[PDB]
């Protein structure tokens, strides 16, 4: 019924919201079965259409700068954590620069009987062998994986699940994030690095193809469902 969308645009990144939002209204989960809430974490004063729409929730979040912008992701999600458990059945995170090209239905929702959790295959690694996966390799990070270990390389920019299951992931990973800071370790790919470990312990109930991560200006043997805008 309810779909929480988590979205972060700080500094200039807010220039992505307008279109992400618009496309979402056309394509993403449009069935009267679903009510979509938008949690948009930003330091910008006003979003687009934020005045007319009651489902656009601006959350005041200052600019953390790179990498902490991406690194602190679950720290930032967890501020409204209690709100999130109230208002949403499912959560999904989109990288700021995504654009919906095609209709997305209930096909992507993890079942009940599952662990249900969702992840997308990184577009750069879908055609490569796991030696080529950019997994954090220092056993000093929480995000470390043994060489020749792991099934897929998962992307930072789209993830989700049952609200209860994806939050456990935010807190769990949020903690790993914190442990590494105590060791002065920053995983190589940051949150992506860490989510891949979690999805190693936790194979995701749904693994979406790279079509959902299709880069703008790459040729790939899929139809793009979701597109990645190029800066
Ligand atoms: C899709 C890509 O996302 C950002 O960069 C990601 C980076 O992309 C590499 C990819 O790893 C490589 O295999 C492919 O052939 O070329 C891309 C070069 O851009 O991959 C790492 C994983 O190691 C992270 O996922 C990075 O976020 C972005 O900055 C790129 O512009 C592009 O949109």
């Amino acid at each position: 019924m309810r779909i929480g969308i988590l979205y972060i645009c700080t500094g200039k990144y807010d220039i992505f919201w307008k279109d992400f939002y618009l496309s979402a209204e056309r394509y993403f989960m449009q069935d009267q079965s679903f009510i979509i809430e938008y949690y948009v974490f930003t330091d910008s004063p006003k979003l687009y259409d934020e005045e007319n729409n009651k489902h656009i929730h601006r959350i005041k979040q200052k600019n953390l700068g790179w990498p902490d912008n991406t690194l602190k992701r679950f720290h930032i999600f967890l501020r409204i954590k209690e709100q999130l458990e109230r208002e949403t059945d499912y959560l999904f995170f989109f990288n700021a620069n995504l654009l919906f090209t095609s209709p997305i239905g209930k096909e992507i929702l993890p079942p009940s009987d599952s662990n249900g959790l969702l992840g997308t295959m990184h577009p750069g690694f879908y055609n490569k062998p796991n030696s080529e996966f950019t997994y954090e390799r220092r056993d000093a990070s929480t995000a470390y994986i043994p060489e020749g270990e792991g099934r897929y390389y998962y992307a930072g920019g789209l993830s989700g699940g049952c609200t209860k299951a994806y939050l456990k992931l935010c807190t769990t990973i949020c903690s790993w994030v914190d442990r590494d800071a105590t060791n002065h370790i920053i995983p190589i790919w940051h949150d992506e690095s860490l989510i891949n470990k979690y999805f190693l312990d936790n194979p995701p109930a749904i693994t979406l193809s790279p079509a959902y991560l299709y880069p703008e200006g790459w040729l790939l043997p899929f139809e793009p469902i979701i597109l990645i805008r190029d800066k």
Side-chain angles (χ1 to χ4, degrees):
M1 175 85 85
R2 299 160 297 164
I3 303 311
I5 275 187
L6 296 160
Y7 183 100
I8 302 163
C9 51
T10 70
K12 11 206 67 57
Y13 279 56
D14 41 14
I15 53 198
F16 296 111
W17 164 250
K18 175 169 173 289
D19 302 285
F20 168 81
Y21 165 52
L22 295 166
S23 70
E25 291 288 37
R26 167 77 178 88
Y27 293 113
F28 176 66
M29 293 300 188
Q30 289 287 349
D31 180 32
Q32 331 194 294
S33 303
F34 308 120
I35 312 141
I36 279 72
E37 319 283 5
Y38 292 79
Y39 308 99
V40 174
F41 301 76
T42 153
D43 68 325
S44 157
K46 190 194 61 175
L47 296 172
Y48 170 87
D49 194 74
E50 181 205 354
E51 29 192 342
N52 325 336
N53 200 332
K54 87 117 175 300
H55 306 280
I56 299 175
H57 306 252
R58 183 161 96 246
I59 323 278
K60 179 180 298 295
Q61 169 64 230
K62 175 201 170 160
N63 187 29
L64 293 86
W66 179 270
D68 270 327
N69 273 343
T70 181
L71 189 44
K72 298 309 222 229
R73 281 193 182 170
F74 315 86
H75 290 143
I76 301 188
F77 292 154
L78 289 183
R79 295 224 290 87
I80 76 191
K81 161 183 189 165
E82 295 297 348
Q83 180 167 338
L84 261 10
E85 322 182 34
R86 227 174 284 138
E87 328 191 327
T88 73
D89 296 305
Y90 288 94
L91 284 165
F92 296 100
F93 171 81
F94 296 91
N95 253 351
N97 51 334
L98 278 48
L99 187 70
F100 292 81
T101 52
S102 140
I104 297 169
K106 63 199 61 179
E107 74 260 20
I108 80 183
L109 306 179
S112 306
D113 20 290
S114 60
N115 64 328
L117 234 54
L118 168 148
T120 313
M121 298 180 29
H122 201 294
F125 309 100
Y126 79 97
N127 59 314
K128 299 169 185 173
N130 102 62
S131 52
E132 242 32 271
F133 297 172
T134 321
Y135 290 156
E136 167 60 276
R137 304 300 191 163
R138 300 173 272 181
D139 73 340
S141 165
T142 2
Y144 160 72
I145 309 189
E147 208 70 37
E149 216 138 299
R151 309 121 191 133
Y152 299 103
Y153 194 79
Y154 290 106
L158 189 165
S159 30
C162 297
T163 300
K164 238 56 168 176
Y166 189 84
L167 280 150
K168 175 168 186 167
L169 171 167
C170 297
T171 50
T172 303
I173 285 179
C174 153
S175 83
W176 296 353
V177 172
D178 275 346
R179 306 230 248 100
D180 280 20
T182 58
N183 291 50
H184 301 89
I185 298 290
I186 296 180
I188 21 186
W189 291 122
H190 314 98
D191 75 79
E192 196 173 83
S193 294
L194 292 139
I195 183 135
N196 253 298
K197 170 70 159 89
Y198 192 97
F199 277 163
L200 188 61
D201 313 346
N202 279 24
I206 282 171
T207 308
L208 289 182
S209 84
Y212 298 87
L213 287 157
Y214 201 113
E216 190 176 52
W218 287 23
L219 183 59
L220 254 58
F222 307 104
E223 270 209 277
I225 301 332
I226 319 153
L227 203 243
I228 292 172
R229 282 174 274 160
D230 176 319
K231 28 285 189 68

